[PDB]
Each structure stands twice: as structure tokens, then as C-alpha cells.
């Protein structure tokens, strides 16, 4: 790998705005998964035979 | 590797706003797992056989 | 590994604001997980077999 | 590694604002794990065989 | 490793601003973990086997 | 190592500045732990086997 | 190791400030662990088997 | 180790300024601890084989 | 070790200043430890086995 | 006027979220007016003959 | 005017985040105005005959 | 005016997070006004005849 | 006025948090007016004819 | 002027945490105003006739 | 003016926390005015008829 | 004026905390004025006709 | 005036924390004002015509 | 003026803490002013015509 005079970007996340409003919320929950929320993942390299690189709200058995 | 006069960005997370505005919230939990915020991760190498790199609300049994 | 009058950000979070504003909140767990806030997490080389990296609000069993 | 001239950031957490309000929380907790704050985690360098690099809110059994 | 004239940042966590009102809190707690504040962690290098690096709100059984 | 003319920090927590207020706050606890504060951590090396470097309420049996 | 004319930082915290005010705040134990306060750990080097680096609010059984 | 004009900091705390300022406060406790205060640790190397460096609010049985 | 007109800090703790009122204050203690102040610990070198190195409210059983 | 159990909102601006990002910025001015940020006003009542109420980058002659 | 359990806000800006980054950025300026940055003003009552309320980047001549 | 049992806000300005960067800023300036920075003003009543209430970046003549 | 059992806030700045980063920074200025900085100003009534409230960044000629 | 067991906040500046890093500045000035700082000013009643009340980095001839 | 079992505060300044740090800082002046530091100031009641109540970095001819 | 069973503050700057940190300062003055440091001032009542109630960096001429 | 059973405080500075750090400081000056430290003024009441009542850092002529 | 079993304090200044280290400090002064120092004022009533309460720094012709 060779740069000579550059400029580059490898796995990035950015520039997000939110804005959010709720009156009433009410989250009733047994042994799964929520998420209600705001999640940014930036990764380059993952390496592995089964594994798992990025995950919300997964429910594995 | 080899930069000469270069610029780079590698598993990178910038640039995030967020307002959230609630009245009333209730969350009510067994064994699982219930995330409502901002959560932000950046990574760059992760190496495994059977490895989780980012999880947010996850349940393994 | 070689640079030369270069800049670089590897594995780097930054730039994040957060305004918040709630009225009534209730929380009732029982031995899951629950997370609700600002959460940041940065890292730029992780290695193992079967390890976690990074994990928010995870039950394992 | 070499570096001649350069500036970099590696495995770094910086520039977070943070505003919260809340006029009435209640929190009921069993032997479980809740976090209801700002956490920043930056690291380097993790290796193991099968550690656990950053958590927030986790429970293992 | 060799650095001529350079500057740099390995597991680094810098500028944090936070501001927290609450008119009621009230903490209800068996042998769990409760973290309700702010925790900043930095880290270059964590070395083992099975070991634990950063950890905030963990119950181990 | 070889440092000629250099400026470096490894494992460093600076820059931190947080401002609380609360009106009435009540902390109920059974053998477990609870953590509502500020905590630094700044570790540049940790080694064993199975230990554990940084941990903010913590349970372990 | 070799340094020359460099300036160099490891494992330090500085630069914290912390303004709190409560009103009314009330705290009842059994053989648990509560911390409310200001802490700070600033560590080089760590090394041991099973050791323990840093802990703030832990209950071991 | 050599060093040759240069200026180093190995694990070290450095400024840090609280105020805290309360109305009413009570603490019951039985054969747990509480801690709520300023707290401040440096250490360059701590060395063994099941020690504990740093404890803060700390029970063990 | 080698120094040649260079300036070294080795686990030190400096530059603290602390301002606290309180109208009222009620403790109420049966055997175990309440630490309510200004606490500051710096060591260099320490070595053993199973040694403790720095305690604040610490319950041994 | 009566308000008997409600809620109102009279002259308010709340919930914005703004992300800007700029490489190269050049401003050049004569005894004008230039405006480049972020600007909210809010106001209940303004009363007057030949008033201005709200003005954002505003030439007079 | 008369209020019975009611809530009311009349006049006020509340909630905004915003993050900026600029690479290069120059301002020449002669006798006018420039503003480039984050302005909230709130005000309830303005009376006069020909005043001005709220102004940014105002020339008058 | 009577109020009984009410909550009310006049002329606020509340919940404001802002974070900034630039790496090269150069301004220059004759006889006008410049302003880049963080301002919020808050007022209740004001009252004249030719007065001016708030002003940021204002040039008279 | 009478006020029975509410809870008011009238002419308030609360609750802002700020970071800011600059590499370089240059001012040349000649009779005029600049600021770079955080400027809070809270006030309730000001009475006059041709008063100024509040000011930042002015020039009067 | 009557309360009866009430709260009120009448022009208060409160909660206000500011980071602040830059590596050079430099400032070069003749006979105008420079303000580079954190300000904070309350005030409840001011009265006059052509009278300033609050004014920062201001310019009068 | 009677209160019976209230509280107020009235032109009140309170919970500023601020860290700064600067490599190399240069200030050249004429007779103008420079300001670079905290300033707080808090008043009640302020009367006259062509008064100042509040300057920094003030310059009158 | 009529207090029973009430409390009040009028006047009053408290909570601050500062910790500041520069390498290189150099400061070059004529016959102006330059202030860089904290200052707090707190006042009640002051009456005049042309008076200057509080000043920091003032040029009178 | 008349207070039974009350507590106030009128014109008073309390609560503030300052920690300083520097390593080449150089001051140069003509006849004019530099004021480099920690100043608190704190004053009930100031009546007069033409007077001042708080100064730091003042040029008359 | 009548007081039955009240606290009162006027014009108090208290609770101040400040620690300072400097290595190299120069000052060459010409008829002017210079003051690096910790200075506190308290004044309950200052009466007169053209007087100056308080003055710290102050250079008058």
C-alpha cells in the first residue's frame, strides 16, 4: 500500500442528526431483546471463522 | 504501508447530534436486555475464530 | 509501517453532543441488563479466540 | 514503525457534550446490572484468548 | 519503534463537558450493580488469557 | 524504542469538567454495589492471566 | 529505552474539575459497597496473575 | 533506560479542584463500606501474584 | 538507569484543592468503614504476593 | 385569562440538531452584514410604533 | 391573570445541540458585523417606540 | 397575577451542548464587530423608548 | 403578585456545556470590537429610554 | 409582593461546565476590545435613563 | 414585600466549572483593553441615569 | 419587607471551580489593560447617577 | 425590615477552587494595568454620585 | 431593623482555596500597575461622592 498526496476515508460513519419526541412509552419485556435508541458502528477489518461483526437486537440460542 | 504526505480516516465516528424529549417512560425488564440511549463504537481490527466484535441488546444462552 | 509527514486517526470517536430532557422515568429489572445514557468506545486492535470487544446491555448464560 | 514528521491519533475518545434533565427517576433492581450515565472507554491494545474487552451494563452466568 | 519530530495519541480520552439536574432519585438495590455517573477509562495495553479490561455495571456468577 | 525530538501520551485522561445538582436523592442497598460519581482511570500496562484491570461497580461471586 | 529532547506522559490524569450540590441525600447498607465522590488512578504498570488493577465499588465472594 | 533532556511523567495525578456543597445528609451502616469523599492514588509499578493495587469502597469475604 | 540532565516525576500526587460545607451531617456506623475526606496516596514501588497496596473503606473477612 | 389544568406553550423554539463540516472557508466584507450559524429567538409580546423585533443580518440606512 | 395547576413556558429556547469542524477559515472584515457561531436569545416583554429587540450582524447608519 | 400549584418558565434559555474544532482560524479586523463563539441571553421585561434589548455583532454610527 | 405552592423561573441561563479545539489562532485588530468565547447574561427587568440591555461585540460611534 | 411556600428563581445563571485546548494563540491588539473567556453576568433590576447594563468586548466614542 | 415559608435567589451566579490548557500564548497591546480569564458577576438592584452596571473588556472615549 | 421562616440569597456567586495550565506565556502592555486570571464580584444595591458598579479590563479616557 | 426565624445571604462570595499551573511566564508593562491571579469582591451596599465601586485591572485618565 | 432568631451574612467573602506553581516568572514594570496574587475584599457600606470602594490594579491620572 502506497499514498502519495491523498486523501481518503475507510470505514467511517459521520454527519447523523435526530431529534426525537415521545408523549407516553411503555416497553414491557421477557428474556428477547430491545433497542430504541440511536447506534453507529464503524469498523476496517473483522476477521474470523463464525463470528459475529456487528449486531443490535439479536437473540442467539 | 507506506503515506507520503496523506490523509486518512480508518473506523472513524464523528460528527453526531442528538435531542430526545420524553414525558413519561416505563420500562419493565426480565432476563433480557432493553437499551434506549447513544452508543457510539470504532474500531479498527478485530481477529478471532468465534468472536463478537459489537453487540447492543444482544441475549446468548 | 512508515509515514512521512502524514495525519492520520485510526480507531478514534469524537465529536458527539447530546441534550436529554425526561418528566417521569421508571425502571423495574429483574437479573437482565438494562442501559440508558451516553456510551463511547474506541479501540484500534482487539485479538483473541473467542473474546467480546465491545458489548452494551448483554445477558449471556 | 517509523514515524518522521507526522501526527496520529490512535484509539481515542474526545469532544463530548452532554445535557440531561429529569425531574422524577426511580430505579428497582434484582441481581442484574443498569447503568444510567456517560461512560467513555478508549484503548489500544487488548489480547487474550477469551477476555472481554469493554462492557457496559452485563451480566454472565 | 522509532518517532523523529512527530506527535502522537495512544489511548487517550480528553475533553468531556457534562451537566446533570434531578429534582427526585430514588435507588432500590439487591446484590446487583447499579452506576449512575460519569466514568472515563484509558487504557494502552491489557495483556492475559481470560482477563476483563473495562468494565461498568458487571455481575459475575 | 527511540524518541528524537518527540511529544507523545500514552494512557492519559485530561480535560474533564462536570457540573450536578439534585434536590433529593435516596440510595437503598443489599450486598451488591452502586456508584454515582466521578471515576478517572489512566493505566499504560496491565498484565496477568485471568485479572482485571479497570472495574466500576462491580459483583463478583 | 532512549528519549532525547522529548516530553513525554504515561498513565496520568489531570485537569478535573467537579462542582456538586445536594439538598437533602440519604444512604442505608447492609454489607454492600457505595461510593459518591471524586476518584482518580493514575497507574504504569500492573502485573500479576489474578490480580485486581483498580476497583471502585466491588463486592467479591 | 536512557534519557538525555527530556521531560517525562510516569503515574501521576495533577489538578484537580472540587467544590461540593450539602443541606442534610445521613449514612446507616452495617459491616459494608461507603466512601464519599476525594480520593486520590499514583503508583508507577505494583507487583504480585493476587494482589490488589487500587480499592476504593472495596468488600471482600 | 541513566539520567542526563533531564526532570522526572515517578508516582506523584500534586496540585489538589478542595472546598466542602455541609449544614448537617448524621453517621451511623456498626462494624464496618465510612470514609468521609481528602485522601491522597503516592507510592513508587511495591512488592509481595498477596499484599494490598492502597485501601480506602475496605472490609476484610 | 384562566388556565385550569393544561398545558401551553406560547413563543418557544426547542429541538434542534445541527451537523456542519466545512474544508475551506473564506469571508471577505465591507461595512455590511454576514450571518453564518446557528440563530433562535423566541419571544412572547413585543409592542411598538416603528420597532424591529427580530433581525438576522440586517442593513440600516 | 390567574393559574390553577397548570404548566405553561412563554419565551424560551431549549434543546440544541450542534457540533462544527473547519479545516482553514479566514475573516476579513472593515467596519460592518459578522457573527459565525451558535446565538439563542428568550425574552418574554419588549416595549418601546422604535427600539430593537433582538439583532445579529446589524449595521446602522 | 396569582398562581396556585403551577410551574411556569419566562424568558429561558435551558439545555444547550455545542462542541467545536478548527486547525486554522486568522481574523482580521478594523473598526467593526467580529463574534464566533457560544451566546445566550435571557430576559424577562425590558422597556423603554429607542433602547435596544440584545445585540450580538452590532455596529452603530 | 401571590404565588401559593408553585415553583417559577423567570430571566434563567442554565445548563449549557461546551468543548472547543483550535490548533492556530491568530487576532489582529484595530478599534473595534471582537469575541471568541462563552457569554451568559440573565436579567429580569431593565427600565430606561435609550438604554442598552445587553451587549456583545459593539461598536458605538 | 406575596409567596406563600414557593419557589422561585429570579435572574440566576446556573450550570455551565466549559473545556477549553489550544496549542498556539497569539493576539495582537490596538486601542479596541478583545474578549476571549468564559463571562457569566445575572442581574435582577437595573434602572437608569441612557444607562448599559451588560456589555462585553464593547467599543464607545 | 412578605414571604412566609418560601425560597428564592435573586440575581445569582452558581455551579461554573472550567479546565483550560495552552501550549504558547502571546498577547501584545496598546491602549486598548484585553480579557482572557473567568469573570462572574452577580447584582440585585442597580440605579442611576447614565451608569455602567456590568463591562469587560470595556474601552470609552 | 417581611420574612418568616424563609430563605434567601440576593447577590451571591458560588460553586466555582478552575483549573488552568499553560506552557509558554508572554503578555506586552502600553498603557492599556489586560486581565487574565478568575474574578468574582457580588453586590446588593449601588445607587449613583453616573457611576461604574463593576469593571474588569476598562479603558477610560 | 423585619425577619423572624430566616436565614439569607446578601452580597457574598463562597465555594471556589483554583489550581494553577505554569512554566515560563513574562511579564512586560508601561504604565498600565496587568492583572494576572484570584480576586473576590463582595459588597451589601455602594451609593455615591460619580463613584466606582469595583475595579480590576483599570485605566483612568 | 429587627432580627428574632435568624442567620444572616453581609458582605462575606469565604471558603477559598488556591494552590500555584510556577518555574520561571519575570516581571519588569514601568510606572503602571502589576498584581499576581490572591486578594479579597468585604466591605457591608461604602458612602460618598466621587470615592472608589475597591480597586485592584488600578492606574489613575
Same mark, same amino acid.
Given at each position: ?10 470505514? %467511517? @460513519?459521520? *454527519? &447523523?442528526?435526530? !431529534? /426525537?419526541? $415521545? #408523549?407516553? =412509552? ?6 428477547? +431483546? %430491545? @433497542?430504541? *435508541? &440511536?447506534?453507529? !458502528? /464503524?469498523? $476496517? #477489518?473483522? =476477521? ?6 456487528? +449486531? ?6
Amino acid at each position: 500500500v502506497l499514498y502519495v498526496g491523498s486523501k481518503t476515508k475507510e470505514g %467511517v @460513519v459521520h *454527519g &447523523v442528526a435526530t !431529534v /426525537a419526541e $415521545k #408523549t407516553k =412509552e411503555q416497553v414491557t419485556n421477557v428474556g428477547g +431483546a %430491545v @433497542v430504541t *435508541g &440511536v447506534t453507529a !458502528v /464503524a469498523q $476496517k #477489518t473483522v =476477521e474470523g471463522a463464525g463470528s459475529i461483526a456487528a +449486531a443490535t437486537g439479536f437473540v442467539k440460542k
